Amino acid sequence: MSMAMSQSNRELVVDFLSYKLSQKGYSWSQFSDVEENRTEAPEGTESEAVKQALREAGDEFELRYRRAFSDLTSQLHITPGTAYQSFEQVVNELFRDGVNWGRIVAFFSFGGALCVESVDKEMQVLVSRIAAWMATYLNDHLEPWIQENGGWDTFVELYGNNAAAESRKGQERLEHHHHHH
Numbered sequence: 001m002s003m004a005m006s007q008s009n010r011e012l013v014v015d016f017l018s019y020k021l022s023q024k025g026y027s028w029s030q031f032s033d034v035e036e037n038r039t040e041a042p043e044g045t046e047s048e049a050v051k052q053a054l055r056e057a058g059d060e061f062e063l064r065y066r067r068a069f070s071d072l073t074s075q076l077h078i079t080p081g082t083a084y085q086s087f088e089q090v091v092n093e094l095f096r097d098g099v100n101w102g103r104i105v106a107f108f109s110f111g112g113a114l115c116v117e118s119v120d121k122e123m124q125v126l127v128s129r130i131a132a133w134m135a136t137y138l139n140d141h142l143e144p145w146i147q148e149n150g151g152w153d154t155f156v157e158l159y160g161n162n163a164a165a166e167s168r169k170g171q172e173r174l175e176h177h178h179h180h181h
């Protein structure tokens, strides 16, 4: 008997990773062929879920916790001889005190920095690794958690764009009340 999980989480590591990379100037990728059509009106077009949410939180994280993050990225020096263990360790402590969206996003970034550091050392080859190491920890040290707090749907409904605006809707309203009161 055996069993596994989904892949969504993994998609986050890739999508985000790329973002953290592009933000630094890097990128790298490839193309291919499949099969599809279209006939309406092409344009940027954007979503409004984990993708957008995750990113934002990431940028704001290093902003509010510029030090809390920096000091972290300096706690682990990824290398070819580095063992996935040395990784799951550092991330463990930062996650020792229970689990909360905050630490979650604050964590994701940790990895992003690792990649930025790898490329800086002309070792982008690592990116692929750290990327897999995350999807492994997120599915063995978070999955069970994220599924106990309403998955991501909740994270995007709390500390997310559509959510941010939603919050204001109320406030701007409440204030109007006391005023008319």
Ligand SMILES: O=C(NS(=O)(=O)c1ccc(NCCSc2ccccc2)c([N+](=O)[O-])c1)c1ccc(-c2ccc3sc(CCc4ccccc4)nc3c2)cc1
Binding pocket: 057, 058, 060, 061, 064, 065, 068, 069, 072, 075, 089, 090, 091, 093, 094, 095, 100, 101, 102, 103, 104, 105, 106, 107, 159
């Ligand atoms: O912010 C946090 N929590 S929150 O109140 O739930 C929150 C606060 C703000 C936001 N968003 C607004 C932007 S700020 C932000 C901050 C964090 C995440 C996302 C956003 C969000 N959120 O979006 O989910 C959540 C938060 C922020 C930082 C840390 C944090 C920082 C450094 C370290 S170093 C360490 C172990 C050391 C150690 C290292 C190695 C080896 C051994 C020991 N553990 C750490 C934990 C822990 C929690």
